[PDB]
Amino acid sequence: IQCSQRMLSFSDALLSIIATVMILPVTHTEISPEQQFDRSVQRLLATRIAVYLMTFLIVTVAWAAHTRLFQVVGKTDDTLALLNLACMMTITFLPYTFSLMVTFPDVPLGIFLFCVCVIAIGVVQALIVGYAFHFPHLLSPQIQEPLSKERVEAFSDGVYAIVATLLILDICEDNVPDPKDVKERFSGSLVAALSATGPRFLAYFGSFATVGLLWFAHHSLFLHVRKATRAMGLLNTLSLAFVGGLPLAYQQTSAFARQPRDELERVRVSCTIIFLASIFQLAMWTTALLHQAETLQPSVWFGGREHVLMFAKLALYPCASLLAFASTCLLSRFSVGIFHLMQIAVPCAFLLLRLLVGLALATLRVL
Amino acid sequence: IQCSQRMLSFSDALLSIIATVMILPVTHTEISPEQQFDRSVQRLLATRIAVYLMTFLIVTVAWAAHTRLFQVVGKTDDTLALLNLACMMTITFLPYTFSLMVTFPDVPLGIFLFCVCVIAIGVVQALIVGYAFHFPHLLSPQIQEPLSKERVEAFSDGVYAIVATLLILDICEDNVPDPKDVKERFSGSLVAALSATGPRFLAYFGSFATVGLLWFAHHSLFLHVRKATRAMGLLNTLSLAFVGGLPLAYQQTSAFARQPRDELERVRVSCTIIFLASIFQLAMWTTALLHQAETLQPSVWFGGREHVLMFAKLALYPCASLLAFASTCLLSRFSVGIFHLMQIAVPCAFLLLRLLVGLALATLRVL
Ligand SMILES: [Cs+]
Ligand SMILES: [Cs+]
Ligand SMILES: [Cs+]
Ligand SMILES: [Cs+]
Ligand SMILES: [Cs+]
Ligand SMILES: [Cs+]
Ligand SMILES: [Cs+]
């Protein structure tokens, strides 16, 4: 008899890594063709994004099945650990098989391999269930539809870390000046070759800041959560799926625009991605408020001390993104500056959120 | 006042991702030049490996400093969370700055940037300490050199997951057949194009199996650990550093050998990597046995029930690697088959380890 906490943490890390594999082809796509071939590049980008979304949803369904499986199975052991490793190895083949099926939809080998992988996952899970039932001491006490908050938190942390570190990984792997180019194309100057990669550094800064603030909101929310429901799970899944598109948005934004309208369009896309990623968390919070009596702590109830604080912490990014989208639509001249000032201020607001909330409450107090 | 468990888990995930960034250039190096340029490719590979080792050690020192910092700081808050995000962002620049300094050792800008990043990390940590001391309620009770087992476990899990998923990530990103090549170079056959990528699938299978079994040994060990020391931390750091070289070893092994001696050499390299990765864990276990009274549970003491079991679970891989190295040295004809049979059996031994241990104890019993 052994504790299964670390095994489930490792499984969550593996699944979070496997769910964000189809987002690398997205971030590795050309920022622009520079040869008036925008149509084909956008076609391929949209196809890759759809494939990423579908693979993420499938891996999340698998992760939920795993969480239920190990919720009915309390304690683990050596054999159960090896079977869980086998299940993870089987799940690792879902993205490849799905991409193969969607790329060759005419030949039946792709769907065959996909169904084979699914049946293998199911068979491993059934073997785990059988081993757990043959040894009743490996079952939960209640055995001898709320999700597990620990698994949700671990999955979200892994996804956020990967999405925040994608760009720095790409930089460290690829954007390192080489002596030849440094002293040939930049006239013997390292500072020039480093400044040439300024846009990527700024994109990484912005993506990391945004992802970290979203994770901060998520962590402040789930600190007052008692029972995670399946609707909250779906909403968090959608939020995490739309969070993987922040690196691409920032890459496009930091890229030099061929025409002034492309800058506005890219800012709109980035603001929409952020708005979705944050409004899904806000929807999770509202669905929790629906049954706060059995979903949230008394501190964030209707009338608590940290209720308005959490409201604002979760509605800051959606409101800012909506205002930026409007400025892009209505003003259309000061949109980039507004977006940059939002990027620079939202962190400051998160830091001084309590003072601003108090000031606003005092403003509504005597008015 | 908020719990800092999830914040430290996120920090550990980020640091584990940042520590394994310099291993991607290693796995992305050409398996062979095929033009009799082995010398230059091996030079670059060794340089990349040394850079990876140094960056891993530096990031591990930073992670240890962070663990001590948040061991003296018990509880966290919003400001502390934002400062920890800033510290992580600063640490994320250590690999890039170190590679820049080691690539341009003549110009002082690289070492300048490295020292600037180090001083920024130090300043963020000092600000965290000051904020924690100005608010005594954020300090540990003992405040108002054993490491923290949770941080070690999380870091190890992240490293193992990344090292196990590197190859499947590369496959899903790169080794997906395209219709044009499929129906042009393979004469209209998808199964042929898929079998053409068989070596990479086998390499991923082997790497995942080995990394998962090493993680299984680590998880069985740290389940009986009470107090992790700094020597055990150094040994685990070395083990994790040498674990990142398993993907490259398996890539080289699965690659077709130009001459029969290159196969033996690659098998020797793989066996040596595995031997180091496992013997460092064995050394950690022995250093724990040294002070078991305050480092291990009574179950794995000298004379316990699970003592020999853990001995064998930790000494299985080193002994197998040593036997394979010998076979490469002495036999030199059946070395590849022996290595493959070890790869296929070590999992079976882990599964049936208790029965084999009992059989061996009965063999020493009546003999
Ligand atoms: Cs966790
Ligand atoms: Cs993780
Ligand atoms: Cs990655
Ligand atoms: Cs953890
Ligand atoms: Cs991790
Ligand atoms: Cs990762
Ligand atoms: Cs990776």
XYZ file of C-alpha atoms and ligand atoms in Angstrom:
741
model
C 0.000 0.000 0.000
C 1.478 3.304 -1.177
C 0.224 6.855 -1.580
C -0.794 7.756 -5.132
C -0.265 11.527 -4.888
C 3.084 11.639 -6.688
C 2.009 9.090 -9.301
C -1.027 11.203 -10.179
C 1.131 14.342 -10.241
C 3.475 12.661 -12.727
C 0.499 11.521 -14.805
C -0.893 15.065 -14.822
C 2.470 16.453 -15.931
C 2.685 13.889 -18.734
C -0.869 14.609 -19.885
C -0.328 18.375 -19.790
C 2.786 17.930 -21.925
C 0.931 15.656 -24.354
C -2.019 18.053 -24.656
C 0.166 21.019 -25.703
C 2.157 19.204 -28.397
C -0.004 20.343 -31.325
C 0.550 24.010 -30.393
C 4.236 23.914 -31.373
C 3.455 23.611 -35.120
C 1.269 26.688 -34.625
C 4.011 28.791 -33.030
C 6.535 27.493 -35.589
C 4.472 28.711 -38.555
C 5.783 31.653 -40.557
C 4.656 34.940 -39.022
C 4.085 36.129 -42.601
C 4.931 34.857 -46.104
C 6.250 38.250 -47.317
C 5.343 37.126 -50.865
C 1.600 37.902 -50.955
C 0.721 34.292 -50.067
C -1.267 35.169 -46.942
C -4.174 32.945 -47.998
C -2.296 29.629 -47.970
C -0.403 30.392 -44.759
C -3.651 31.362 -43.031
C -5.315 28.187 -44.326
C -2.557 26.004 -42.885
C -2.560 28.000 -39.640
C -6.312 27.568 -39.176
C -6.049 23.846 -39.908
C -3.249 23.486 -37.354
C -5.249 25.458 -34.778
C -8.307 23.249 -35.270
C -6.163 20.119 -34.967
C -4.639 21.519 -31.773
C -8.055 22.258 -30.274
C -9.393 18.795 -31.103
C -6.293 17.029 -29.764
C -6.440 19.110 -26.582
C -10.094 18.202 -26.050
C -9.411 14.501 -26.657
C -6.442 14.451 -24.276
C -8.558 16.285 -21.700
C -11.300 13.665 -22.014
C -8.644 10.994 -21.489
C -7.292 12.867 -18.460
C -10.796 13.119 -16.993
C -11.335 9.391 -17.491
C -8.001 8.805 -15.742
C -8.995 11.074 -12.850
C -12.255 9.178 -12.372
C -10.420 5.846 -12.646
C -7.986 6.800 -9.886
C -10.766 8.397 -7.851
C -12.479 5.010 -7.661
C -9.013 3.519 -6.983
C -7.646 5.078 -3.807
C -4.182 3.636 -3.198
C -1.624 2.403 -5.728
C 1.269 -0.063 -5.780
C 4.088 -1.271 -8.026
C 1.861 -3.142 -10.482
C -0.612 -0.253 -10.586
C 2.271 2.164 -11.163
C 3.543 0.126 -14.112
C 0.023 -0.121 -15.538
C -0.366 3.654 -15.172
C 2.920 4.118 -17.026
C 1.543 1.883 -19.781
C -1.677 3.914 -19.887
C 0.329 7.132 -20.201
C 2.411 5.608 -22.998
C -0.797 4.644 -24.804
C -2.309 8.110 -24.349
C 0.886 9.650 -25.741
C -0.099 8.241 -29.159
C -3.462 10.032 -29.389
C -2.221 13.287 -31.010
C -0.159 11.472 -33.645
C -2.990 9.104 -34.567
C -5.537 11.928 -34.681
C -3.327 14.082 -36.908
C -2.738 11.072 -39.159
C -6.476 10.406 -39.438
C -7.295 14.055 -40.155
C -4.464 14.336 -42.710
C -5.383 11.131 -44.605
C -9.183 10.981 -44.214
C -9.632 8.666 -47.218
C -7.483 5.669 -46.223
C -8.848 3.631 -43.274
C -5.460 3.056 -41.614
C -5.535 6.341 -39.693
C -8.939 5.836 -38.093
C -7.919 2.220 -37.495
C -4.834 3.310 -35.549
C -6.867 5.894 -33.630
C -9.460 3.309 -32.595
C -6.660 0.882 -31.708
C -5.054 3.461 -29.415
C -8.415 4.231 -27.798
C -9.124 0.531 -27.256
C -5.638 0.055 -25.800
C -6.228 2.880 -23.320
C -9.569 1.320 -22.422
C -8.034 -2.129 -21.990
C -5.275 -0.802 -19.731
C -7.878 1.017 -17.637
C -9.999 -2.141 -17.423
C -6.957 -4.143 -16.315
C -6.284 -1.518 -13.646
C -9.898 -1.770 -12.468
C -9.698 -5.560 -12.357
C -6.465 -5.535 -10.370
C -7.938 -2.985 -7.960
C -11.104 -5.042 -7.456
C -9.240 -8.332 -6.991
C -7.362 -6.584 -4.140
C -10.056 -4.680 -2.205
C -7.396 -2.959 -0.081
C -6.545 -0.821 -3.143
C -10.065 0.656 -3.357
C -11.367 3.864 -1.837
C -13.139 3.471 1.530
C -16.529 4.530 0.154
C -16.223 1.752 -2.441
C -15.022 -0.971 -0.041
C -19.866 13.708 -10.178
C -17.334 16.194 -8.796
C -13.806 16.233 -10.168
C -10.655 16.181 -8.043
C -9.303 19.683 -7.455
C -5.709 18.433 -7.196
C -5.711 16.985 -10.714
C -7.319 20.106 -12.191
C -4.770 22.334 -10.463
C -1.805 20.227 -11.591
C -3.029 20.058 -15.192
C -3.624 23.814 -15.271
C -0.202 24.542 -13.770
C 1.513 22.346 -16.346
C -0.385 23.912 -19.240
C 0.355 27.438 -18.022
C 4.054 26.705 -17.500
C 4.398 25.188 -20.974
C 2.533 28.062 -22.623
C 4.678 30.605 -20.773
C 7.992 28.879 -21.545
C 7.349 28.014 -25.214
C 8.843 31.264 -26.498
C 11.907 31.281 -24.245
C 12.544 27.659 -25.230
C 12.364 28.589 -28.912
C 14.705 31.535 -28.305
C 17.306 29.583 -26.332
C 17.208 26.824 -28.954
C 17.225 28.951 -32.109
C 17.810 32.685 -31.495
C 21.418 32.523 -30.257
C 23.829 34.660 -32.332
C 26.582 32.774 -34.129
C 30.056 34.355 -34.437
C 30.114 34.203 -38.245
C 26.838 36.069 -38.763
C 27.630 38.358 -35.824
C 30.914 39.640 -37.264
C 29.795 39.435 -40.919
C 26.247 40.824 -41.161
C 26.359 43.163 -38.132
C 29.853 44.615 -38.735
C 31.530 43.056 -35.707
C 29.007 43.935 -33.003
C 27.202 41.563 -30.649
C 24.876 44.208 -29.202
C 23.466 44.815 -32.686
C 22.771 41.124 -33.298
C 21.111 40.949 -29.877
C 18.919 44.000 -30.491
C 17.930 42.427 -33.815
C 16.141 39.770 -31.721
C 14.367 42.398 -29.615
C 10.884 41.637 -30.951
C 11.083 38.005 -29.824
C 12.283 39.018 -26.356
C 9.399 41.483 -26.050
C 6.915 38.857 -27.234
C 8.235 36.425 -24.626
C 8.012 39.101 -21.928
C 4.400 39.878 -22.793
C 3.339 36.247 -23.125
C 4.966 35.315 -19.817
C 3.376 38.278 -18.037
C -0.099 37.527 -19.394
C 0.105 33.787 -18.725
C 1.446 34.398 -15.225
C -1.337 36.839 -14.399
C -3.945 34.411 -15.730
C -2.397 31.672 -13.590
C -2.444 34.076 -10.638
C -6.172 34.625 -11.149
C -6.744 30.872 -11.474
C -4.740 30.184 -8.304
C -6.571 32.876 -6.339
C -9.879 31.407 -7.522
C -9.175 27.740 -6.783
C -7.877 28.702 -3.328
C -11.506 29.332 -2.295
C -12.975 26.377 -4.227
C -14.291 23.410 -2.230
C -15.863 21.087 -4.828
C -14.998 21.250 -8.522
C -17.893 20.244 -10.775
C -17.891 18.874 -14.308
C -19.189 22.147 -15.757
C -16.333 24.001 -14.068
C -14.043 21.350 -15.529
C -15.324 21.945 -19.057
C -14.960 25.703 -18.611
C -11.396 25.346 -17.315
C -10.635 23.043 -20.247
C -11.874 25.656 -22.716
C -9.897 28.361 -20.904
C -6.694 26.312 -21.064
C -7.319 25.483 -24.726
C -7.659 29.173 -25.580
C -4.653 30.032 -23.392
C -2.304 28.125 -25.709
C -2.903 30.759 -28.390
C -1.333 33.638 -26.447
C 2.224 32.953 -27.684
C 1.075 33.101 -31.311
C -0.916 36.270 -30.635
C 2.086 38.004 -29.072
C 4.392 36.790 -31.848
C 2.070 38.326 -34.435
C 1.658 41.540 -32.428
C 5.391 42.100 -31.927
C 6.022 41.399 -35.618
C 6.415 44.409 -37.889
C 3.204 45.106 -39.795
C 3.388 45.336 -43.580
C 0.423 47.741 -43.581
C -1.139 49.704 -40.705
C -4.378 47.693 -40.872
C -2.611 44.393 -40.173
C -1.494 45.792 -36.814
C -5.103 46.559 -35.880
C -6.201 43.101 -37.031
C -3.495 41.345 -35.006
C -4.334 43.430 -31.935
C -7.985 42.448 -32.364
C -7.044 38.764 -32.594
C -4.864 38.963 -29.480
C -7.558 40.802 -27.528
C -10.154 38.219 -28.564
C -7.923 35.326 -27.487
C -7.291 36.953 -24.104
C -10.988 37.768 -23.733
C -11.977 34.143 -24.297
C -9.254 32.778 -22.017
C -10.365 35.061 -19.175
C -14.136 35.025 -19.721
C -14.109 31.241 -19.452
C -12.526 31.570 -16.003
C -15.134 34.204 -15.138
C -17.839 31.773 -16.273
C -16.320 29.060 -14.081
C -16.450 31.483 -11.153
C -20.097 32.335 -11.866
C -21.059 28.665 -12.182
C -19.424 28.197 -8.786
C -21.347 31.147 -7.333
C -24.497 29.376 -8.537
C -24.050 26.739 -5.789
C -21.525 28.533 -3.579
C -23.093 26.759 -0.591
C -21.352 23.566 -1.783
C -18.732 24.972 -4.188
C -17.012 28.000 -2.590
C -15.778 29.127 0.803
C -17.804 31.681 2.803
C -15.143 34.316 2.066
C -16.180 34.651 -1.595
C -19.939 34.319 -1.146
C -22.456 37.018 -2.072
C -21.688 39.406 0.779
C -18.237 38.196 1.846
C -15.004 40.081 2.383
C -13.108 38.868 -0.709
C -16.115 38.662 -3.049
C -15.667 41.922 -4.965
C -11.899 41.386 -4.883
C -12.213 38.065 -6.713
C -14.816 39.535 -9.074
C -12.342 42.225 -10.079
C -9.358 39.867 -10.218
C -11.298 37.736 -12.709
C -12.998 40.533 -14.695
C -9.925 42.759 -15.086
C -8.537 41.037 -18.180
C -11.904 40.588 -19.974
C -12.797 44.257 -19.491
C -9.357 45.405 -20.645
C -9.519 43.184 -23.731
C -13.019 44.448 -24.535
C -11.884 48.065 -24.198
C -8.897 47.367 -26.453
C -11.148 45.705 -29.038
C -13.438 48.734 -28.959
C -10.511 51.139 -29.335
C -9.436 49.100 -32.357
C -12.970 49.377 -33.746
C -13.939 52.952 -32.821
C -10.722 54.953 -32.412
C -8.525 52.931 -34.811
C -5.582 55.343 -34.450
C -4.410 54.942 -30.837
C -5.146 51.215 -30.587
C -1.562 49.928 -30.451
C -0.583 52.405 -27.746
C -3.692 51.512 -25.757
C -2.874 47.805 -26.038
C 0.710 48.396 -24.905
C -0.410 50.534 -21.963
C -2.871 47.799 -20.977
C -0.085 45.214 -21.155
C 2.024 47.444 -18.907
C -0.753 48.428 -16.471
C -2.790 45.240 -15.896
C 0.181 43.920 -13.870
C 0.244 47.139 -11.841
C -3.511 46.840 -11.303
C -3.074 43.256 -10.097
C -0.405 44.521 -7.699
C -2.524 47.454 -6.459
C -5.882 45.719 -6.927
C -6.908 46.056 -3.278
C -6.252 49.805 -3.156
C -8.164 50.369 -6.400
C -11.071 48.239 -5.165
C -11.197 50.254 -1.950
C -11.093 53.521 -3.887
C -13.941 52.382 -6.144
C -16.014 51.222 -3.172
C -15.486 54.625 -1.547
C -16.396 56.369 -4.815
C -19.817 54.310 -4.839
C -20.050 54.985 -1.092
C -20.552 58.763 -1.081
C -22.073 59.036 -4.580
C -2.555 34.522 4.153
C -2.590 31.792 1.501
C -1.043 28.358 1.111
C 2.118 28.302 -1.004
C 1.921 24.666 -2.144
C 0.573 25.350 -5.635
C 2.836 28.365 -6.152
C 5.899 26.259 -5.356
C 4.612 23.470 -7.610
C 4.295 25.956 -10.477
C 7.782 27.291 -9.740
C 9.181 23.750 -9.762
C 7.497 23.032 -13.096
C 8.908 26.237 -14.582
C 12.407 25.490 -13.286
C 12.297 21.897 -14.539
C 11.290 23.180 -17.973
C 14.049 25.806 -17.924
C 16.701 23.288 -16.845
C 16.015 20.920 -19.775
C 16.088 23.552 -22.529
C 19.728 22.995 -23.517
C 19.056 19.285 -24.155
C 16.902 19.992 -27.222
C 19.894 21.168 -29.321
C 21.517 17.867 -28.341
C 18.613 15.706 -29.518
C 18.246 17.859 -32.654
C 21.844 17.244 -33.754
C 22.436 15.059 -36.796
C 22.605 11.394 -35.813
C 25.472 11.112 -38.311
C 26.987 13.317 -41.042
C 27.102 10.495 -43.639
C 29.983 12.397 -45.302
C 32.941 11.304 -43.140
C 32.682 14.461 -41.002
C 32.238 12.621 -37.701
C 34.903 14.742 -35.998
C 33.151 18.110 -36.343
C 29.711 16.739 -35.468
C 31.133 15.042 -32.372
C 32.926 18.264 -31.403
C 29.701 20.264 -31.598
C 27.786 17.513 -29.786
C 30.275 17.439 -26.909
C 30.197 21.231 -26.646
C 26.392 21.199 -26.540
C 26.418 18.445 -23.905
C 28.833 20.393 -21.705
C 26.719 23.537 -22.073
C 23.629 21.523 -21.134
C 25.305 20.091 -18.035
C 26.520 23.500 -16.869
C 23.143 25.161 -17.466
C 21.389 22.328 -15.628
C 23.713 22.705 -12.643
C 23.238 26.487 -12.567
C 19.447 26.217 -12.776
C 19.547 23.585 -10.031
C 21.570 25.913 -7.802
C 18.969 28.609 -8.459
C 16.162 26.165 -7.651
C 17.878 25.200 -4.393
C 18.251 28.859 -3.438
C 14.544 29.303 -4.198
C 13.635 26.283 -2.067
C 15.601 27.661 0.879
C 14.076 31.115 0.350
C 10.538 29.731 0.503
C 11.468 27.399 3.352
C 12.314 30.438 5.471
C 9.116 32.039 4.092
C 6.172 29.861 5.078
C 3.024 31.434 3.640
C 2.619 33.521 0.486
C 0.233 36.190 -0.793
C -0.551 38.206 -3.918
C 2.544 40.415 -3.750
C 4.754 37.420 -2.965
C 3.184 35.529 -5.870
C 3.943 38.370 -8.284
C 7.502 38.625 -6.957
C 7.919 34.864 -7.415
C 6.688 35.217 -10.995
C 9.300 37.937 -11.498
C 11.994 35.694 -10.009
C 10.992 32.877 -12.364
C 11.091 35.266 -15.325
C 14.591 36.339 -14.289
C 15.770 32.740 -13.875
C 14.408 31.932 -17.341
C 17.236 34.066 -18.787
C 20.095 32.071 -17.231
C 20.521 29.480 -20.036
C 20.503 32.105 -22.793
C 23.011 34.338 -21.007
C 25.277 31.401 -20.164
C 25.262 30.119 -23.747
C 25.990 33.649 -24.966
C 28.928 33.991 -22.570
C 30.361 30.586 -23.493
C 29.911 31.251 -27.230
C 31.526 34.727 -27.166
C 34.126 34.396 -24.381
C 36.194 37.349 -25.646
C 33.638 40.187 -25.555
C 32.560 41.255 -22.033
C 28.871 41.716 -22.893
C 27.994 38.059 -22.316
C 29.477 37.797 -18.830
C 27.974 41.222 -18.133
C 24.486 39.980 -19.022
C 25.021 36.803 -16.994
C 26.058 38.766 -13.906
C 23.138 41.148 -14.460
C 20.685 38.239 -14.524
C 22.244 36.752 -11.385
C 22.074 40.101 -9.584
C 18.453 40.529 -10.680
C 17.558 37.118 -9.249
C 19.348 38.058 -6.036
C 17.578 41.416 -5.835
C 14.158 39.833 -6.347
C 14.936 37.291 -3.628
C 16.096 40.062 -1.286
C 12.890 42.003 -1.949
C 10.900 38.860 -1.152
C 12.838 38.444 2.101
C 12.253 42.079 3.028
C 8.526 41.865 2.347
C 8.316 38.650 4.371
C 10.182 40.187 7.316
C 8.159 43.415 7.288
C 5.059 41.188 7.660
C 6.017 38.595 10.303
C 2.795 36.659 9.655
C 4.347 35.472 6.360
C 7.282 33.758 8.110
C 7.585 30.156 9.216
C 6.698 29.495 12.878
C 10.251 28.496 13.818
C 11.440 31.863 12.478
C 8.715 33.983 14.119
C 20.355 21.991 6.219
C 17.785 19.497 4.926
C 16.017 20.159 1.646
C 12.255 19.975 1.137
C 11.187 16.590 -0.221
C 8.188 18.080 -2.045
C 10.333 20.374 -4.190
C 12.806 17.594 -5.009
C 9.973 15.260 -5.998
C 8.267 17.868 -8.186
C 11.512 18.832 -9.928
C 12.370 15.183 -10.566
C 8.883 14.436 -11.898
C 9.052 17.377 -14.291
C 12.512 16.427 -15.534
C 11.500 12.797 -16.051
C 8.301 13.733 -17.888
C 10.151 16.116 -20.208
C 12.904 13.592 -20.919
C 10.328 10.884 -21.641
C 8.163 13.069 -23.900
C 10.946 14.778 -25.887
C 10.963 12.130 -28.613
C 7.191 11.839 -28.991
C 7.002 15.636 -29.178
C 9.618 15.669 -31.936
C 7.738 12.911 -33.779
C 4.308 14.539 -33.551
C 5.820 17.855 -34.653
C 8.059 16.619 -37.472
C 7.576 12.930 -38.375
C 4.034 13.124 -39.786
C 3.766 11.840 -43.386
C 2.675 14.386 -45.973
C 0.405 13.287 -48.855
C 2.819 14.417 -51.580
C 5.805 12.431 -50.308
C 3.519 9.555 -49.306
C 2.098 9.015 -52.797
C 5.295 10.041 -54.636
C 8.262 8.417 -52.866
C 6.436 5.402 -51.372
C 4.330 4.505 -54.443
C 0.950 5.393 -52.962
C 1.182 3.605 -49.615
C 0.789 5.104 -46.148
C 1.859 1.961 -44.284
C 5.242 2.131 -46.021
C 5.810 5.768 -45.057
C 4.825 4.895 -41.485
C 7.171 1.903 -41.289
C 9.924 4.170 -42.623
C 9.660 6.011 -39.278
C 9.883 2.769 -37.297
C 13.307 3.500 -35.798
C 12.077 6.723 -34.185
C 9.017 4.978 -32.740
C 11.231 2.244 -31.284
C 13.623 4.828 -29.844
C 10.701 6.627 -28.207
C 9.373 3.340 -26.820
C 12.736 2.459 -25.297
C 13.405 5.930 -23.911
C 9.941 6.139 -22.357
C 10.268 2.676 -20.814
C 13.699 3.403 -19.338
C 12.753 6.848 -18.028
C 9.528 5.496 -16.549
C 11.325 2.662 -14.780
C 13.925 5.080 -13.416
C 11.106 7.318 -12.182
C 9.455 4.245 -10.657
C 12.652 3.480 -8.745
C 12.936 7.115 -7.642
C 9.300 7.162 -6.494
C 9.663 3.888 -4.594
C 12.787 5.278 -2.917
C 11.425 8.683 -1.897
C 8.296 7.001 -0.514
C 10.424 5.771 2.417
C 12.503 8.963 2.749
C 11.917 11.175 5.797
C 14.568 13.919 5.554
C 16.328 14.795 2.305
C 19.878 16.054 2.829
C 22.039 18.278 0.651
C 24.274 15.374 -0.388
C 21.199 13.440 -1.509
C 20.166 16.591 -3.358
C 23.479 16.796 -5.207
C 23.274 13.104 -6.092
C 19.709 13.468 -7.383
C 20.818 16.509 -9.383
C 23.605 14.508 -11.020
C 21.197 11.637 -11.702
C 18.688 13.964 -13.367
C 21.456 15.638 -15.371
C 22.621 12.276 -16.713
C 19.014 11.186 -17.317
C 18.563 13.845 -20.008
C 21.007 11.941 -22.218
C 18.837 8.829 -22.587
C 16.890 10.157 -25.604
C 20.126 10.831 -27.495
C 21.493 7.414 -26.534
C 18.379 5.642 -27.809
C 18.324 7.749 -30.980
C 21.902 6.706 -31.722
C 21.218 3.061 -30.846
C 18.129 2.762 -33.052
C 19.982 4.445 -35.924
C 21.448 2.172 -38.581
C 25.176 1.674 -38.044
C 27.514 2.442 -40.932
C 29.984 -0.163 -39.630
C 29.482 -2.941 -37.062
C 31.843 -1.286 -34.562
C 29.741 1.883 -34.359
C 26.851 -0.214 -33.037
C 29.041 -1.547 -30.225
C 30.287 1.964 -29.447
C 26.762 3.402 -29.300
C 25.601 0.526 -27.093
C 28.540 1.220 -24.779
C 27.627 4.914 -24.604
C 23.980 4.139 -23.840
C 24.922 1.604 -21.168
C 27.306 4.098 -19.561
C 24.646 6.822 -19.492
C 22.128 4.454 -17.899
C 24.757 3.210 -15.444
C 25.522 6.742 -14.272
C 21.856 7.739 -14.054
C 21.067 4.706 -11.888
C 24.265 4.507 -9.823
C 23.709 8.080 -8.672
C 20.307 7.035 -7.314
C 21.964 4.023 -5.681
C 24.510 6.385 -4.113
C 21.681 8.582 -2.831
C 20.111 5.488 -1.273
C 23.408 4.491 0.363
C 23.986 8.006 1.705
C 20.504 7.746 3.197
C 21.294 4.348 4.725
C 24.283 6.048 6.363
C 21.910 7.923 8.721
C 18.741 5.881 8.204
C 17.815 6.665 11.817
C 16.970 10.213 10.657
C 16.689 9.736 6.872
C 14.642 6.585 6.122
C 11.617 4.753 7.461
C 12.092 1.585 9.549
C 10.814 -0.498 6.616
C 14.005 0.017 4.580
C 16.519 -0.151 7.426
C 19.277 -2.756 7.701
C 17.076 -5.708 8.629
C 13.664 -4.478 7.466
C 11.055 -6.109 5.268
C 11.516 -3.961 2.136
C 15.283 -3.460 2.464
C 16.501 -6.059 -0.039
C 13.554 -5.194 -2.285
C 14.661 -1.561 -2.537
C 18.298 -2.627 -2.918
C 17.340 -4.711 -5.935
C 14.955 -2.113 -7.364
C 17.831 0.382 -7.340
C 20.670 -1.965 -8.380
C 18.818 -3.701 -11.228
C 19.614 -1.116 -13.900
C 23.277 -0.557 -12.885
C 23.988 -4.296 -12.905
C 22.251 -4.764 -16.258
C 24.165 -1.854 -17.790
C 27.448 -3.209 -16.421
C 26.718 -6.661 -17.848
C 25.862 -5.115 -21.221
C 29.080 -3.077 -21.183
C 31.045 -6.235 -20.422
C 29.311 -8.163 -23.209
C 30.267 -5.321 -25.547
C 33.862 -5.581 -24.320
C 34.335 -9.351 -23.950
C 31.834 -11.062 -26.259
C 31.539 -8.285 -28.880
C 29.314 -10.407 -31.154
C 26.047 -10.832 -29.223
C 26.084 -7.384 -27.607
C 23.166 -5.829 -29.502
C 20.909 -8.807 -28.838
C 21.879 -8.766 -25.166
C 21.090 -5.049 -24.944
C 17.706 -5.553 -26.609
C 16.846 -8.474 -24.327
C 17.801 -6.340 -21.320
C 15.567 -3.534 -22.588
C 12.730 -6.046 -22.922
C 13.338 -7.891 -19.629
C 14.197 -5.176 -17.075
C 10.513 -4.132 -17.210
C 9.457 -7.743 -16.627
C 11.912 -7.962 -13.730
C 10.457 -4.783 -12.225
C 7.007 -6.351 -12.567
C 8.083 -9.697 -11.059
C 10.755 -8.241 -8.769
C 9.192 -9.602 -5.576
C 8.977 -13.173 -6.881
C 12.579 -13.072 -8.108
C 13.768 -11.628 -4.790
C 11.969 -14.403 -2.926
C 13.459 -17.036 -5.222
C 16.965 -15.644 -4.697
C 16.488 -15.495 -0.925
C 15.361 -19.132 -0.981
C 18.337 -20.061 -3.179
C 20.736 -18.412 -0.448
C 18.545 -20.045 2.213
C 19.278 -23.730 1.574
C 22.722 -23.245 -0.016
Cs 0.749 18.613 -8.229
Cs 3.165 19.932 -14.587
Cs 7.632 22.495 -25.099
Cs 4.003 18.809 -7.020
Cs 6.433 19.410 -13.479
Cs 7.513 20.722 -21.254
Cs 10.129 20.084 -24.565
